[PDB]
Amino acid sequence: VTSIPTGCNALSGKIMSGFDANRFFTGDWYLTHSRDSEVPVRCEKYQTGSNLQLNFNGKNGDVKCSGSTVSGNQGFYSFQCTTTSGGSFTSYMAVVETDYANYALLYRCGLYGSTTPKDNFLLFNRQSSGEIPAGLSTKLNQLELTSLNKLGCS
Ligand SMILES: CCCCC/C=C\C\C=C/C=C/C=C/C[C@@H](O)CCCC(=O)O
Ligand SMILES: N[C@@H](CCC(=O)N[C@@H](CS)C(=O)NCC(=O)O)C(=O)O
């Protein structure tokens, strides 16, 4: 697979310049807000390791993922994930904006077995108590993300 799924937004011209994977894929990231949200809301902690490995506490069990760059779409990563219940899936993401030490705004998209993509904008924070940073105000306006839903972290 050399490009993101048809229907997924490549966000051309809307992604930060100079993204540094070495600084982003380190430590823990809490998923604190999102454009679209489920009920009940939860607090997912994404743990990162070397070579684009990650672990998080998903809807029904731990999820382990392995990432790789997407050759045809600058900034995008493909993650192959497995769940403790025995399931597997693929998901795509790009970092739209981040300061690495506090927050990160991501886009995520996948087909998940369908022909219709399901996507989202995600706000990650280094602290579970993190909320919406002042530095993203204009970017959120531009992307029409004026009302991010707060999830289950505090
Ligand atoms: C610290 C970087 C974390 C970003 C990793 C991105 C993708 C791989 C990890 C998890 C993917 C989970 C996808 C589940 C989606 C589905 O339940 C909700 C669809 C809308 C959405 O993307 O939120
Ligand atoms: N809807 C399809 C696909 C479901 C699917 O792939 N779900 C993935 C992505 S939402 C999953 O299990 N994620 C676990 C998690 O996000 O914690 C099915 O029921 O087989």
The C-alpha atoms of residue 7 and residue 134 are separated, in whole angstroms, by 31
Q: Which element (helix H / strand E) includes 23?
A: helix 21-24
What secondary structure letter does DSSP report for 59?
Answer: T
The C-alpha atoms of residue 29 and residue 83 are separated, in whole angstroms, by 19
Tokens, residue 85: 């219940």
The C-alpha atoms of residue 51 and residue 117 are separated, in whole angstroms, by 27
Query: Residue 95 phi/psi, 5° resolution?
Result: -85, 115
The C-alpha atoms of residue 49 and residue 86 are separated, in whole angstroms, by 22
Q: How many CB atoms lie within 10 A of CB 51?
A: 8
Three-class SS state of 39: coil
Pocket of ligand 2, candidates 55, 64, 89, 91: which has the most ligand atoms within 8 Å of its Cβ, to mutate? Answer: 89
Tell me the domains of the chain and their CATH numbers: 1-154 (2.40.128.20)
Residue burial 57-72, b: 16+ Cβ < 10 Å; e: rest:
ebeeeebbbebeebee
Nearest ligand 2 atom to alpha carbon 58 = 17
Q: Which element (helix H / strand E) includes 142?
A: helix 137-142
Q: Which one of the ligands is nearest to 110 CA?
A: 1
Query: Residue 119 phi/psi, 5° resolution?
Result: -130, 175
Residue burial 18-44, b: 16+ Cβ < 10 Å; e: rest:
ebeeeebbeeebbbbbbbeeeeeeeeb
For residue 44, the CA-to-ligand 2 centroid distance in Å is 15
104: nearest Cα among 34, 50, 57 = 34
* Resolution in Å, one decimal place: 1.4
Tokens, residue 145: 């993300």
Three-class SS state of 104: strand
The C-alpha atoms of residue 54 and residue 78 are separated, in whole angstroms, by 12
The number of residues making up the chain comes to 154
Find all residues with CB under 8 Å of 62, minimum gap 6, and list them.
Answer: 55, 56, 83, 84
For residue 89, the CA-to-ligand 2 centroid distance in Å is 7
Chain position carrying tokens 């679209």 = 36
What residue owns the CA closest to ligand 2's atom 17? 58
Q: How many CB atoms lie within 10 A of CB 86?
A: 7
Which residues are paired to 125 by β-bridges? 30, 103
Pocket of ligand 2, candidates 112, 114, 116: which has the most ligand atoms within 8 Å of its Cβ, to mutate? Answer: 112
130: nearest Cα among 23, 28, 38, 16 = 28
The C-alpha atoms of residue 151 and residue 39 are separated, in whole angstroms, by 9
